[PDB]
Structures are given as structure tokens and as C-alpha cells.
Amino acid sequence: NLIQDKQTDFGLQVFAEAVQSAPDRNLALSPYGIASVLGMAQMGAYGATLKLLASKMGYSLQERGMPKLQRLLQRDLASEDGVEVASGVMVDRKIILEKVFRRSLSKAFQSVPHQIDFSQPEMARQVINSWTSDHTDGMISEFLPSGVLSELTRLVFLNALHFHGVWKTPFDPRNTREQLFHTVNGSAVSVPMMTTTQKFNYGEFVSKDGVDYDVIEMPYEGESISMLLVTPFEKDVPLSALNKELSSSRIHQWRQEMRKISKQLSIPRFSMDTEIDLKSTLSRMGLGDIFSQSRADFSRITTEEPLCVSKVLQRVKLEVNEEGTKGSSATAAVIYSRMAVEEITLDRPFFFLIQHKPTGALLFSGQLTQPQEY
Ligand SMILES: *[C@@H]1O[C@H](CO)[C@@H](O)[C@H](O)[C@H]1NC(C)=O
């Protein structure tokens, strides 16, 4: 809907700032997860800080009927098989919380703020890691490494997501082969390339800046979730040129302009485990003041003292491999055609989006720039 698209757009903007500052690195974020934590921050914000957040995000969770929308969204995504996701706010145990913040987090997120003794950073780390692990079924067992929290840490918003998908149609691992992937370096490296032929939802598009590109869709079993793979046509045009195609409306027009068509698709097998501290990106988006001791207004969290965000952290993890619906065939029925099936091989950096179709939410937005890394 309208506000789903606003969340998707806000999260893709964060994604687009992240890749702009690190064009050569593998990166997976969760637009849903990012909107979720900044939605938590909104519940605590007041005055100019609320106004700032609401204007950058495009909506306000403090407005009538909005907590129920956040809550149903969160409920629908978390209930997907394969999805383990956790968001929460961790606040120093010494701070006296306002009831309104408690009531807001319960109404929109069915959560409570988690009080942490940050004056003992290594204990705080173990407590936060165990909580995150318990709430992701162990899939994110050590959310934070040492050196992130300090004794000065007061308020942390975090989101953790692991996703184990099963393709509707399995890849045959016997069809997986070492083939060359071209990095932004110009260098070529040989990696396992999974391959399959099937009728694929497929479209060709051109960006605003006249860059020609394709998008191809691959469903997980159930078809509530599917991955969209997006890449420049020309092998020597960088992935960067596409950063601004990623909007919820552009995704809407991809879905109505795409049609099924036989294709031989080859894509690297890869895993990503991306940890990100979102300060630098959010500040590039104009949200720097939420981190400022002098300018941030979280009066809804506490009125007894100044308070600004210490950290906004996300960790996202997924493994993309051959696994498909058990006992299903890797291969279509043999239909003869004088039509040569076009090959699409993803042997240069590409975007991948993983979308929940009922809500339209993006569980992931990532770029693969080097398949041999996480
Ligand atoms: C590119 O630089 C050299 C080869 O040109 C290599 O050692 C390095 O790891 C490459 N980096 C990436 C990200 O492919």
C-alpha cells in the first residue's frame, strides 16, 4: 500500500547511500528492518526530531491507525517460514523511561524497550547477543563483536535478519560449474555458477539516465517470497548507474511489464553476512541530528535528561544456493522450439531484492560484487 511503499523507498534510499559510499563491496541490507528500527526511534522522538524523521521517512507512526499497520506488517513477515528477524531498542538501565514510549512500542511493535547495563560493555554485549540469538532461533548468534559498545553507550536500535529460502524449482548442483565472474577491479575470478532453464518472469528496461538493464524474477516455494535480480545490459557499464532505479514505484512497473519467457539463467552461489552501523548513511540522508547530544529530542523516551541515539545497527545474513522444494525436478518438460533460448549469466555485479509479495515489503536489498566473500 501507500505507506508500505514509503517504507520500501526509505529503506532503498538508505541502501542506495550505502552502496554509493562503498561501490566495490558486497552489501546486503533489509529495507523492512531499517524502516522497523527507525520506526522504533520515531516512537521516542518528539518536537523537531520527530518532524525531521517524519519528513525523511515520509510517514509518522505517531499518527492515528499507523501503529496497527506497523504491527500487522511485522506480524506477516515474521510468520514467513525461513524468516528469523528481530528488532529492538536497548536503553541504559539508569534512564527513567516515559510510559508513552512503552505504550507506543507495545502498540506498534509488540515490543518492550530492553534495559541494559552499558557501563559494563562486555557484559552488555553478551546480553544483547543472547537476546538477539533467542529472537532469531539462533540464526544470528553473535550479533555484535567486541569494540562496538562503550561505557558511553546509552541508546541502541538494532535489527537482525536471517533468511533461509527454498527455491520453488531447485537448481541441480551437478549443473553448477566454475565460471568467471568480473569484479569492478576489472579482474576475473572463477566461482561456482549455478544454472537453470525455466520460464522466467523477465523484463528489459532503461533507467532515467539512459542505462539499459534487465530484471529477472525467481520464486521461492509458496510464492509469497521471490528474488528480483537486476543488472546492466552492457558488461562494461558499472552497477552504480542503476542505484536510483530502486524505488517502490519502479518495482511496481517492473512487475506489470515483466512476462514469463524461457531463459537459461546462471547465477553465482553466494552467502553474505553484512554488519552495518547506519550512522554514516543516515547522516548522509539528513538524519545526523538524531545522534547529536545537543540537537536530538527523545523526550518521549525520557524527560529527565538529554538523550540522543548512540547506534543504529543492522546485521543481515543469507545463503543463496541450489536448494529447492524437496523431490521437485530441476528440469522443465522438453518442448522443442526453433527459438534459441537466450542465456542470462550473472557474471558481473548485480542487485538482488528479496520481496514479500503480500505486503510488498523488501526483506533484502543487496549488491553482489565479489561472490568469494561474505
Ligand atoms: C583486484 O586487485 C588485485 C588484482 O588486480 C587483487 O589482489 C584484488 O584482491 C582484487 N580485488 C577485488 C575486490 O577483486
Q: How many whole angstroms from 369 Cα to the centroid of ligand 1?
A: 12
- Asked if residue 20 is part of any domain, the answer here is no
**Phi and psi at residue 180, to the nearest 5°:** -90, 135
DSSP state of 206: E
Does some domain include residue 365?
no
CA of 186 to the centre of ligand 1 (A): 8
Q: Is residue 300 domain-shared with residue 169, that is, in the same domain?
A: no
Q: Are residues 36 and 46 in the same domain?
A: yes
Task: Say if 182 falls within a structural domain.
Answer: yes
Separation CA 244–CA 247 (nearest Å):
7
Reference 46, options 110, 106, 98; nearest CA is: 98
Burial degree of 183 (CB within 10 A; 0-12, 13-18, 19+): middle
For ligand 1, the distance from its centroid to the CA atom of residue 237, given in whole angstroms, is 19
Q: Which amino acid is at 241?
A: A
Beta strand extents in 2-42 (DSSP E only): 27-29
Q: Running DSSP on this structure, what letter comes out for residue 324?
A: B
Q: Give the angle 269-271-272 at the CA atoms, nearest 5°.
A: 140
Q: Ligand 1 centroid to 185 CA: how many Å?
A: 6
How many domains are contained in the chain?
2
Show the domain range for 298: 28-162+273-317+343-352
Which residues have C-beta within 8 Å of that of residue 148, sequence separation ≥ 6?
125, 277, 311, 313
**203 and 75 in a common domain:** no
Same domain, 211 and 302: no
- 223: domain CATH number? 2.30.39.10
CB 213 within 8 A of CB 204: yes
**What 3-state class would DSSP assign to 300?**
coil
200 and 328, same domain (yes or no): yes
d(CA 101, CA 41) in angstroms, rounded, equals: 10
| Matching residue, cell 523477465 | 202
Q: How far apart are the first and last CA of the chain?
A: 33
Ligand 1 test: best mutation among 185, 370, 372, most atoms within 8 Å of CB? 185
- Ligand 1 atom with minimal separation from the 24 CA: 13
**370 CB near ligand 1 (under 6 Å):** yes
Method of determination used here: X-ray
Asked whether 183 lines ligand 1 (CB < 6 A), one says yes
- The answer to whether position 263 is within a domain reads yes
**Grid cell digits, residue 353:** 531484492
Cβ of 187 less than 6 Å from ligand 1: yes
Name the residue with the closest Cα to ligand 1, atom 1: 185
Collapse the DSSP code of 59 into the 3-class scheme (helix H, G, I; strand E, B; otherwise coil) and give the result. coil
The CB-based long-range contact list for 249-256 (8 Å cut-off, 24+ gap) reads 249/5, 251/8, 251/353, 251/355, 252/5, 254/203, 254/205, 254/215, 254/228
Q: What are phi and psi of 193, to 5 degrees?
A: -115, 115
Torsions phi, psi of 361, nearest 5? -65, 140
Amino acid at 129: N
Cα–Cα distance between 23 and 280 in angstroms, integer? Answer: 15
Nearest CA among 301, 309, 317 for reference residue 279: 309
CB 214 within 8 A of CB 337: no
- Residue 348 Cα to ligand 1 midpoint, Å, equals 14
Residues 151 and 182 in one domain: no
Resolution in A, one decimal?
Answer: 2.0
**CA 219, CA 201: separation in Å to the nearest integer?**
9
CA of 273 to the centre of ligand 1 (A): 20
- Report the amino acid identity of residue 263: K
Residues forming a β-bridge with 353: 228, 365
Residues 135 and 178 in one domain: no
Closest ligand 1 atom to residue 369 Cα is 13
Per the domain annotation, does 209 fall within a domain? yes
Same domain, 153 and 63: yes
**229 and 201 fall within a common domain:** yes
**Which one, of 365, 313, 352, 374, lies nearest residue 160 by Cα?**
313
CATH, residue 106: 3.30.497.10
In a domain, 368, yes or no: no
Is 9 inside a domain boundary? no
Torsion sign over Cα 273, 27, 123, 98: negative
The answer on 197 and 324 residing in a single domain is: yes
The answer on 332 and 205 residing in a single domain is yes
CA distance 323 to 197: 15
Cα–Cα distance measured from residue 239 to residue 182, given in angstroms and rounded to the nearest whole number:
12
Q: How far is 284 from 243, CA to CA, in rounded Å? A: 15
Residue of the nearest CA to atom 12 in ligand 1? Answer: 185
Pair (347, 326) in one structural domain: no
Phi and psi, residue 218, nearest 5°: -130, 120
What's the CA-to-centroid distance between 370 and ligand 1, angstroms? Answer: 10
Asked whether residue 22 is domain-assigned, the answer is no
Ligand 1: which atom is nearest the Cα of residue 185? 1
